[PDB]
Amino acid sequence: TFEEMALTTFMITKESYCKLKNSVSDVAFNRYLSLYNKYRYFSGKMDTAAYREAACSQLAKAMETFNHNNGNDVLYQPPTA
Amino acid sequence: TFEEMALTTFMITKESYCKLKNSVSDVAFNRYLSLYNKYRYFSGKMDTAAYREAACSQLAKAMETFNHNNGNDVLYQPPTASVTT
């Protein structure tokens, strides 16, 4: 699933981007995207439940960039493990 | 392009399906798909514009099947023709 992929390190390619997009509703994707700044600039501790959601944001953001900002592949790594 | 790919033989996979769906507007895709029967049971000779459109409907159909039906990596074969000079 998307939440699960968000926690692993892998390459975002046209193929993997695709499967990830198809695995999450567009509504969920945009909500994750909208939480990016909150986690990119999070002060303090992150309970796992928060880290899971922070990872989804990170992934949604990485996907947005791949798609809306270029034509090239990029390695994805979960937030500060 | 989508039109060009419909005239080639290749495997419809999750990745190829993807590049294909992204290369055509949803509207044009549904249009091609709607013409599948017209060309599938077409009686007679066609000009090149019609042949190209027939190939597109065939590709649109193979993609619909891949996505909505089973979703098993399948080979896409453009339509063959008995050409008359």
Residue numbers in the entry:
A (entry chain A): 1 to 81
B (entry chain B): 1 to 85
Article, verbatim:
The WT nsp4C monomer contains four α-helices (α1–α4) and two short β-strands (β1–β2). The refined WT model contains two nsp4C molecules in one asymmetric unit, termed A and B respectively. In the WT nsp4C structure, two monomers in one asymmetric unit are linked by a 2.0 Å Cys425-Cys425 disulfide bond to form a dimer. Notably, the N-termini of the two molecules are not aligned in the WT nsp4C dimer. Instead, they are projected in different orientations, with one molecule rotated by about 150° around the y-axis relative to the other molecule. The N-terminal amino acids Cys425, Lys421, Glu422, Lys426, and Asn429 are located in the contact surface between the two monomers. The hydrophobic cavity of WT nsp4C is exposed on the dimer surface, and the C-termini of the two monomers extend in different orientations. We propose that the surface properties of the WT nsp4C dimer are representative of an “open” conformation given that its positive, negative and hydrophobic areas are all exposed. In WT nsp4C, a disulfide bond at Cys425 causes the C-termini of the two monomers to extend in different orientations, and thus resulting in flexibility and undetectable electron density differences at the C-termini of the monomers. Our WT nsp4C crystal was obtained under non-reducing solutions, so it is considerably easier for two nsp4C monomers to form a disulfide bond in the crystal.
